[PDB]
Each structure stands twice: as structure tokens, then as C-alpha cells.
Symmetry: none
């Protein structure tokens, strides 16, 4: 899939991938998140969030503080480049962002903000 990627977050709190690459030719980029499995969103919610590796911790810590009702993300969080909604099993969501929001020579991370999940669910995103 050019300028896009499909990623799954399953019931074992695992994303199917740990590395995403964005082609510099891509003007925009889409990340499609699906959740195979059977567990509902309150027990095994998955969202997908992108930020520099530097801000990942603060976004997680603040996302937790915001709670369920907030999809565990601090609203208008200026550190978040892009993020999907928190989904439960069987659901799907995509988020498209401008590639110009990313510098070559900077480390980014994608990760889930549901409490405790980032330990397991995280990977790197890099321009190419």
C-alpha cells in the first residue's frame, strides 16, 4: 500500500509491526488500524498515536490522566502529530496526516495510550 500502512492491535496487546516507514515522496500518509479479536474497547482498547520519541512519555502520562471518556488522550495535545480513536475488537479507523509535519533526522514513535499498553504496544516511525 503506497503512502499508507495497515496495522493490527490484537487481544494480547500486540501490534503486528514495530516499524513504519513513510516515503518522502508521500504528500500525505495514512495509518489504518484494525483490532482483530473479541475483547471490547474498555478491556482491550487500541488507538494509534504518533509523536517524536521525545514526547512519547508525556503524551502517555497525560493521556492516562484524561481518561476513558477522552480516549485517554489529552485533547488538543500539541505533541500529537496524528492519532486514531480508541477502538475495540472488530472496529477499524484511519488517520491521514501531512508528511511535511515530519523532519528527516528525527525519531518518531507510534503507540497505544490505553493504560499499561505502551509498554508492549510501541514502534518507531521513520521517513525514507
Amino acid at each position: 500500500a503506497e503512502c499508507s500502512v495497515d496495522i493490527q492491535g490484537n487481544d494480547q496487546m500486540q501490534f503486528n509491526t514495530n516499524a513504519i516507514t513513510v516515503d518522502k515522496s508521500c504528500k500525505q500518509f495514512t495509518v489504518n488500524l484494525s483490532h482483530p479479536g473479541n475483547l471490547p474497547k474498555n478491556v482491550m482498547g487500541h488507538n494509534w498515536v504518533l509523536s517524536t520519541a521525545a514526547d512519547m512519555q508525556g503524551v502517555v502520562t497525560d493521556g492516562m490522566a484524561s481518561g476513558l471518556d477522552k480516549d485517554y488522550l489529552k485533547p488538543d495535545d500539541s505533541r500529537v502529530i496524528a492519532h486514531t480513536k480508541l477502538i475495540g475488537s472488530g472496529e477499524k479507523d484511519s488517520v491521514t496526516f501531512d508528511v511535511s509535519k515530519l523532519k528527516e533526522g528525527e525519531q518518531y514513535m507510534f503507540f497505544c495510550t490505553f493504560p499499561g499498553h505502551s509498554a508492549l504496544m510501541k514502534g518507531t516511525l521513520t521517513l525514507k
Copy 2:
């Protein structure tokens, strides 16, 4: 001390310890479980369940299947030596079991049956 132990499961899906030792001089052993944090039982519940290491996976799988209504535990599971109720933040439980139900030379595990949790929340229990 000695014949009882205070355990906490937090909002970051972790127990405060991963090892417990039962002195053979105890007739009974009491485990007190509290849930520091702010998240609800339906989102981040914790119980504390004891079984041989060999039966743990069955207990976790059959528990998952049982749903929130059953405290993520299969009714009358004979594999479970003991267990607390499933608790939410700001809640607590206690459970006592006769030390005679344990044998020296057998590998025992304590853990949480709330979906996905045992991956991180578990520990060893030994008769020493």
C-alpha cells in the same frame, strides 16, 4: 508479617511484587489485595489467583471466557487453590487458605485473570 502478605495491583497493570514465600510453619496464609489508582474494575480490575504453574494458562483462558460477571474466573474451577474477588480502584479484598493445600517441590503462580493482565501481573509463590 510471616503468615500474611499485602499486595497491590496498580493502574499501570502491575503488582508490587512478583514473588511470595510461604513459611511451612504457617497453618493458614492470608493475602490482602488493594487497588491503588483511579481506574474502574471494568477497565483495570485486579484479582489475585493462585494455582500450580502448570494450570495457570487454563485458569487464565477459561477465566477470560467467563466475563466480568464471573470476576474473570470459571465458577468452581478446581485448578484454583485460592482467589480474591475482582477489584476496582479504591477497593480491597482478602483471602486465606490452608498451607496444607500446597506441597514442597511444586511450582505455584499467583496472578490476575483480567484479560491481557497475566502477561505482566504474576509472580511465584513458594513453600519455604
Copy 3:
């Protein structure tokens, strides 16, 4: 691949894949393991081990007790269906086994036995 799979273990304690499907038509099945990255064996050691889901905890526990010189695997562990050596970055290893060693209706896990890596490095393997 055909009756085989290539899997990598990295410096971020992650396997590139978390679900392995073995086809019944396969007489044998090959698992190729590589460790991209730059960290050595005593620090970011990776082996790939296969056992029923029920046997995983005992294998990991006895494995931690075998020591580094034993690749953190108890020699002659009857629960281990197949395994690799413990490798560091830049190294590679593979193991092939008979598909008749697996049965329909049983749950299998693949995992790393290096101290503290199995909570993050594990996946399922199923005979289809």
C-alpha cells in the same frame, strides 16, 4: 515462506511477528531467527523456544535458573518442542522440526527465555 518463517528479534525486545501458522501439509517446519541491532548476548539475548501454552511458564522459570552459559534453557527440557541457541546482534540461528510433534486442538506459544524478555517476546503458533 513455504513451510518456514523468518523472524527477527531486535534491540527493543520485540519480535517482528506475533502469530505463526503451520500448515498440516508440511512434513517439517523451519523457523529462521536473526537479531538485527547492535547489542551483545548477555544484554539483549534472543532465542526462539516452542512449547504448549500450558508449558510456557515452567519453561521460562526453569530457563531463568539455567544460567547464561546454558542459554537460559534447562537442558533436556521435555516440554520444549523445538528451540534455537541464544543469539546476540549480528548472529543467526534456525531450527526445523516435524509437524507430527504438534496436534490439532492444542495451543502453542513461541517465546524468548532470556531473563525478563518473555513478557514482551512471545506469540502463538497454530497447526492449521
Copy 4:
């Protein structure tokens, strides 16, 4: 007590707590770290490093490059507020620091820099 906290980092790559709150009335604050278990420092070393959340990634990445020889921390790292030595099992270390190096409103994290360990061995520290 009051201006001190006991932290244990075990053989399962975890800390006993994930949140430290330092009371403003403290002039100095102590972190006593111990290491229950039996694994050695070259395989399951733990330290206790403090810095702002925004800085954690850098301290971890740079520390990971410094090596065992440097206790997995960059010498004279200007982002490190306080830190312990890297310890193996049965060892203990303590670090006391001036509370005026912390400011209200700023998010601090404590973590272990041995490669890979920060996935699970981290927590927050707040001046309250």
C-alpha cells in the same frame, strides 16, 4: 520515612512502585534501591535514574550507548537530576538529592537504563 522511598527492582525486570511523590517540605530526598533475586548485573542490572519526562528518551538512548562500563549512563549527563549505581542481585544503593532541583508543575520520571528495561521499569515522580 517522609523524605525517602524504598524501591526494589527484581529479576522479572520490574520496580515495586510506579509513582513517587516528593513532599515540598523536604529539603533533601532519598531513593534507596535494592535488588531482590539471584541474576547478575550483566544480565539483569538495575539503576535508578531521574530526569524530566521530556528528557527520559535522551538519557535512555545515550545511556544505552555508554555501556555496562559506565553503568549504562552518559558520564556527566546534564539531564540527569540524580541517579544510583547499576546493581546486580543482593546489592543495594542510595542516592540523596536537593529537592530544589525539582519544580512544581514539571513532570519527572524515574527509570532503569540497562538496555530494554525502561519498557517496564519506569514511573513518575512529582513534587507535591
